Amino acid sequence: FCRFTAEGVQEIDYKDIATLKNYITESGKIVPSRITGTRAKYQRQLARAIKRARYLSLLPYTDRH
Amino acid sequence: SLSTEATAKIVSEFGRDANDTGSTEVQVALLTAQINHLQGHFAEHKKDHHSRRGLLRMVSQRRKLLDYLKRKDVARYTQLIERLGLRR
Amino acid sequence: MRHYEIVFMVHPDQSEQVPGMIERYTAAITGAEGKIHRLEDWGRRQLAYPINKLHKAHYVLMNVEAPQEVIDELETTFRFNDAVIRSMVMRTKHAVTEASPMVKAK
Amino acid sequence: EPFDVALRRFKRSCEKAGVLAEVRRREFYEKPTTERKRAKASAVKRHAKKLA
Amino acid sequence: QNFLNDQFVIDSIVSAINPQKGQAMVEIGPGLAALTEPVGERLDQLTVIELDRDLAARLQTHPFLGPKLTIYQQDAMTFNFGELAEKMGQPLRVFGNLPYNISTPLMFHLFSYTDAIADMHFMLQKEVVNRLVAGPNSKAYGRLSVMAQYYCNVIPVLEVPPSAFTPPPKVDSAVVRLVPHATMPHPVKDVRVLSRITTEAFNQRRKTIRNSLGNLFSVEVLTGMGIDPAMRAENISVAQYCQMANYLAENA
RNA sequence: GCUUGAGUCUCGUAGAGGGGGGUAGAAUUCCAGGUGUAGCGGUGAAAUGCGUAGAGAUCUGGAGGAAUACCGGUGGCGAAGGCGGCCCCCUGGACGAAGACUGACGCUCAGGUGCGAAAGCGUGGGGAGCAAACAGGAUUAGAUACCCUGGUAGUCCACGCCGUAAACGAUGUCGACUUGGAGGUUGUGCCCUUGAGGCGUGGCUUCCGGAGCUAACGCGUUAAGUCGACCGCCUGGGGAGUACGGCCGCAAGGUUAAAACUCAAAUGAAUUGACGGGGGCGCCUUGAAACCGUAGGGGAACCUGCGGUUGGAUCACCUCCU
Numbered sequence: 012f013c014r015f016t017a018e019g020v021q022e023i024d025y026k027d028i029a030t031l032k033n034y035i036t037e038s039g040k041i042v043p044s045r046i047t048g049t050r051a052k053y054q055r056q057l058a059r060a061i062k063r064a065r066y067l068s069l070l071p072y073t074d075r076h
Numbered sequence: 077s078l079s080t081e082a083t084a085k086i087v088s089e090f091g092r093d094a095n096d097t098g099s100t101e102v103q104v105a106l107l108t109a110q111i112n113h114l115q116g117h118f119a120e121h122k123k124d125h126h127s128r129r130g131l132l133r134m135v136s137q138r139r140k141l142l143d144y145l146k147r148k149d150v151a152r153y154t155q156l157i158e159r160l161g162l163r164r
Numbered sequence: 165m166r167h168y169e170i171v172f173m174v175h176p177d178q179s180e181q182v183p184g185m186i187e188r189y190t191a192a193i194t195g196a197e198g199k200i201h202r203l204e205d206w207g208r209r210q211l212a213y214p215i216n217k218l219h220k221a222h223y224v225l226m227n228v229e230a231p232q233e234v235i236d237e238l239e240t241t242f243r244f245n246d247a248v249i250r251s252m253v254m255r256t257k258h259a260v261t262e263a264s265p266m267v268k269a270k
Numbered sequence: 271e272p273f274d275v276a277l278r279r280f281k282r283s284c285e286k287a288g289v290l291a292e293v294r295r296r297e298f299y300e301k302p303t304t305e306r307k308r309a310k311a312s313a314v315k316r317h318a319k320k321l322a
Numbered sequence: 323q324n325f326l327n328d329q330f331v332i333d334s335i336v337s338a339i340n341p342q343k344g345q346a347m348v349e350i351g352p353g354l355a356a357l358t359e360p361v362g363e364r365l366d367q368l369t370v371i372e373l374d375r376d377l378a379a380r381l382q383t384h385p386f387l388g389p390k391l392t393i394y395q396q397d398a399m400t401f402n403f404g405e406l407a408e409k410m411g412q413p414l415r416v417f418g419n420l421p422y423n424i425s426t427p428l429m430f431h432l433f434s435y436t437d438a439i440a441d442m443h444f445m446l447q448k449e450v451v452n453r454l455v456a457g458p459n460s461k462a463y464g465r466l467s468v469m470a471q472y473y474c475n476v477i478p479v480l481e482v483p484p485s486a487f488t489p490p491p492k493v494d495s496a497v498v499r500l501v502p503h504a505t506m507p508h509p510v511k512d513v514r515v516l517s518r519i520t521t522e523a524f525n526q527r528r529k530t531i532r533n534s535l536g537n538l539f540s541v542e543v544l545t546g547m548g549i550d551p552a553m554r555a556e557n558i559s560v561a562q563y564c565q566m567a568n569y570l571a572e573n574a
Numbered sequence: 575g576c577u578u579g580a581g582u583c584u585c586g587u588a589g590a591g592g593g594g595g596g597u598a599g600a601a602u603u604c605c606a607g608g609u610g611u612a613g614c615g616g617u618g619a620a621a622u623g624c625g626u627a628g629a630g631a632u633c634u635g636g637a638g639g640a641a642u643a644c645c646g647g648u649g650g651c652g653a654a655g656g657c658g659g660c661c662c663c664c665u666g667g668a669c670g671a672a673g674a675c676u677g678a679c680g681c682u683c684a685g686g687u688g689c690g691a692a693a694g695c696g697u698g699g700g701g702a703g704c705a706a707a708c709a710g711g712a713u714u715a716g717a718u719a720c721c722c723u724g725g726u727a728g729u730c731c732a733c734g735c736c737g738u739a740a741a742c743g744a745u746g747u748c749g750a751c752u753u754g755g756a757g758g759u760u761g762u763g764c765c766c767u768u769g770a771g772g773c774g775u776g777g778c779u780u781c782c783g784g785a786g787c788u789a790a791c792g793c794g795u796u797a798a799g800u801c802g803a804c805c806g807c808c809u810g811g812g813g814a815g816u817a818c819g820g821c822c823g824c825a826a827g828g829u830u831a832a833a834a835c836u837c838a839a840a841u842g843a844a845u846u847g848a849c850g851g852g853g854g855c856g857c858c859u860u861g862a863a864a865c866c867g868u869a870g871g872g873g874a875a876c877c878u879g880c881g882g883u884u885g886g887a888u889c890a891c892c893u894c895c896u
């Protein structure tokens with residue numbers, strides 16, 4: 012766990028598409044936190060960020076769109 | 077739920093000095109100012125029952141404090157309710 | 165006053181008037197005695213899915229600390245100005261001055 | 271690119287997408303009480319394995 | 323499905339029927355011999371329908387009964403009771419016991435023959451009988467009881483405990499008799515208008531009739547008929563229902 | 575008088591808490607074409623249904639109403655009912671930090687007042703999808719069910735009402751005390767060699783379990799342990815939350831609430847056989863829904879819709895003294 016905890020301890024993020032891509036399926040769905048290894052605090056922040064990133068077409072909603 | 081500066085004006089009015097917070101006068105005053113302000117909220121937000129649960133807590137808290145002060149000193153009580161126009 | 169991010173996108177075929185837009189909105193900010201801590205453009209940039217049947221639209225960011233009032237003015241100016249195809253306003257915790265990762269990639 | 275290897279690649283992608291399981295379960299509405307009961311039933315049906 | 327078992331109530335039903343010549347009597351659903359015998363006995367000759375052809379053979383081959391009845395073997399909802407009323411010289415007494423899914427159909431078919439029937443005498447389940455006789459202002463009231471009370475005067479005869487039946491149900495049941503009115507106390511221009519008024523109303527029985535029959539009539543029509551549109555559908559007697567039916571029919 | 579309870583202030587923190595207003599991508603249906611053509615659709619199979627006026631399919635364009643895939647969790651918030659796309663606007667509460675301040679200001683609470691799922695009602699909108707009722711096709715000994723094709727109310731919204739739910743942790747509120755253990759979540763301090771770590775230290779919360787308690791089941795520092803203050807409630811089973819009266823409600827009904835009369839029980843937990851249908855391998859042993867509130871149908875007990883709860887099943891014959 013503690014290495015993934017460091018990913019949360021370092022940063023809280025939106026607009027870093029390069030890091031967001033670490034936590035999405037190719038079909039555009041959010042990865043569940045247990046698979047990411049990250050703590051739930053950061054999972055919420057990531058989900059909120061992804062939702063904003065989808066709104067501005069930075070990330071797709073699906074595979075197709 | 078109040079600006080530090082409105083709080084500062086109120087405590088510098090009703091309080092003993094800047095070291096006083098929470099003398100009964102300070103409390104009932106800032107509590108009253110909050111209650112006055114929230115009339116504007118509920119005048120729009122009729123259906124905000126979960127917010128008004130806090131308002132009911134506040135007006136009853138005001139009543140409890142006033143009644144304590146009334147039995148502790150009628151002079152402080154009467155001049156304070158005079159200044160705030162309370163028992164309106 | 166409230167810090168904000170304001171982030172918005174402009175039609176590729178109106179991207180040339182974007183400097184004029186930065187004038188109009190920055191003049192609203194300073195004319196409100198508000199202040200600005202970032203202004204950025206990321207050019208024409210491709211869209212993960214089509215917006216208004218378009219592609220490649222032009223992206224813009226501001227970091228700001230204006231009084232709430234004028235944010236609703238410029239916000240409603242976005243619904244008036246069809247060259248802006250989307251906008252998002254965020255009541256961010258702080259003024260922030262370090263460039264967007266969209267710039268820092270350069 | 272062999273057709274049947276592209277078919278295996280496709281089959282893995284739709285399996286990873288879970289879409290047949292989703293459209294299967296999405297076939298009907300449900301009174302929310304029963305998925306609540308089913309959820310906690312599965313939670314204890316799992317937790318009983320944790321014990322050794 | 324059920325048929326009776328105990329002689330006390332069998333004898334009570336067949337005696338309460340008072341089945342004698344000078345009456346155009348016909349059984350439907352003769353069922354078990356025990357309850358068809360006393361009526362086929364007291365009537366010198368009796369007509370019957372059984373729906374089942376196998377039971378019709380069992381009873382037609384029974385020398386108590388086959389020589390003493392004329393017997394028919396078909397769905398009674400096909401059966402031309404208006405011609406049987408002619409063949410029996412006067413309008414019929416129609417009576418018996420059945421599995422009674424068919425009950426709702428029986429009533430409509432009997433009502434298709436209100437001229438050809440002198441009276442009907444049948445066992446039925448407690449809730450549907452208490453509904454059939456229900457007073458307008460009760461939860462037991464509603465559209466089918468309205469149509470029944472429109473077509474006929476309706477009269478409970480006697481009530482029977484569940485252990486009385488050969489396969490005993492859980493459900494108490496009563497014999498009831500009813501009488502097509504010699505002239506309709508409620509004259510109506512048509513019955514389809516009644517049937518649709520009543521179904522619309524009872525499909526909406528919790529809301530005001532302004533929000534039921536006032537979806538078709540106006541409030542000024544309803545109050546013009548003397549009816550308060552703020553009532554619920556289960557406040558309304560068959561009298562004003564047939565008045566509404568006449569109003570619909572004559573203003574259309 | 576006091577500062578320990580209570581409570582104010584300053585700084586942070588987490589959060590589907592509420593109210594108001596924008597907005598997005600999926601999706602269904604529908605409309606308008608376009609390409610196209612004999613089928614589609616549905617079931618166990620059928621039928622009803624839809625299509626040669628071109629359906630179905632598939633492309634485009636438009637409409638409209640509804641809901642937020644995934645995150646999402648043995649997870650957070652909320653008095654409870656409940657709260658979940660995103661942004662804004664208003665707004666409630668909570669917890670930690672470190673002081674400062676008031677000075678017993680407290681707890682509980684009959685009446686009272688207000689909030690209060692789902693259903694239903696009231697007034698005026700909306701109506702995509704779904705769907706009581708209804709309608710029609712099937713199934714069945716019958717079938718009212720179970721199946722299908724339809725479908726109104728309703729479901730949505732604003733503004734009134736109702737005021738009930740297995741509204742249940744079936745567990746009143748507040749305060750003190752009393753072994754441990756493994757987690758979760760959210761603050762915080764110190765140490766960090768950093769980044770991980772590692773010492774602490776609040777809050778919330780989950781599962782084990784000691785003592786003790788308990789009819790037993792179990793509960794167990796978030797007690798069902800040990801106790802203090804006040805409130806609510808019960809006094810065999812049915813009759814019956816039923817009558818009647820009062821109150822309340824637009825109406826549904828709600829609410830308060832009998833008695834006669836009737837029975838020797840009624841009941842909770844748990845033990846052993848049946849279970850049994852088995853299931854595995856003579857032997858171990860189980861492929862074997864009830865309800866709640868509410869609204870409507872009504873051959874049944876019943877059937878249907880809405881949403882809540884889990885309390886998800888059996889049944890029981892030949893004698894005796896130290």
Ligand SMILES: [Mg+2]
Nearest residue numbers: 529695696728
């Ligand atoms: Mg309505």
Ligand SMILES: [Mg+2]
Nearest residue numbers: 692693728729
């Ligand atoms: Mg509703």
Ligand SMILES: [Mg+2]
Nearest residue numbers: 815816829831
């Ligand atoms: Mg009562």
Ligand SMILES: [Mg+2]
Nearest residue numbers: 655691741882
């Ligand atoms: Mg609940």
